[PDB]
């Protein structure tokens, strides 16, 4: 029918991600999907980050910690088995975000916990010592569909991300969480799955069998095998470190940018751009128009700025980029 209920039985974060990417882009928004999963120890970076700058890869290797590059913008995120995770997808105009939020809150409520929406992402519980975050999430609407996923903090090690990242000095020179463990001592991932599952089946008035997917056999999602292959490949997750002879970076209110490149005979011969900005598009397309560019403040500014007409949301981002570059050349 309409509802699909997908339960990963696998801690493999490339498998879980592929599944996530299949929902966003393979499944028809004719379905209403709840997907519940969790990853073993993993840093997940945004698609335009450079992990050889951002992460302590040596420690990661030593401590056996996985890397995975999601396909969306933004920065690095930790996972362990003490995070329970949820993905909802459904089609429009039927579905908006308040729906999945509703479902999660009910389920928390059904666990003895009352929490609520704090800001645009998180859910928070009210505490004698103030607001304390239990759940981060992220949302996007598309043409045919909306998509919502997030994490519930059951028993995560928070502070671990620190040891796998690297000192970013500029990001440094420029700048409240609790586990459920602490409130319900016996709470399991399975238990927190039933809860959400029911709040889900409650909202829609129906139930369906759970599909227990794991990577030892193809889940029933179109093009999964290709999707899992790419998503798990070293070249996608890591990629070679960038090797060029010039570097420019800067931290901005809206993110860090490293710009790498070569100059021969006064023009750029190759160039690459990383960032942790929520939307990397306009940087991605910047590197795109920087190849061949006359290496001089005026042309760099010119190329940067021709991008405006197709990035009206990001006009400030571009302006500051332009400015920065001009000032940064000599
Ligand atoms: O992580 C973010 O900041 C954006 C998440 C947007 C969800 C997309 C749907 C399938 S994987 S990426």
Swiss-Prot record:
Any Pfam family hit: LplA-B_cat
Similarity-based family: Belongs to the LplA family.
MF annotations from Gene Ontology: ATP binding; lipoate-protein ligase activity; lipoyltransferase activity
UniProt-listed GO biological process terms: protein lipoylation
Protein name: Lipoate-protein ligase A
Cytoplasm keyword on record: yes
Naturally occurring in which organism (per UniProt): Escherichia coli (strain K12)
Sequence ranges assigned to domain BPL/LPL catalytic in this UniProt record: 28-208
Additional comment: In the transfer reaction, the free carboxyl group of lipoic acid is attached via an amide linkage to the epsilon-amino group of a specific lysine residue of lipoyl domains of lipoate-dependent enzymes.
Function: Catalyzes both the ATP-dependent activation of exogenously supplied lipoate to lipoyl-AMP and the transfer of the activated lipoyl onto the lipoyl domains of lipoate-dependent enzymes. Is also able to catalyze very poorly the transfer of lipoyl and octanoyl moiety from their acyl carrier protein.
Quaternary context: Monomer.
EC number: 6.3.1.20
Entries under SUPFAM superfamilies matching the protein: Class II aaRS and biotin synthetases, SufE/NifU
Binding-site residues, ATP: 70, 75-78, 133
HAMAP family per the UniProt record, alphabetical: LplA (MF_01602)
GO cellular component entries: cytoplasm; cytosol
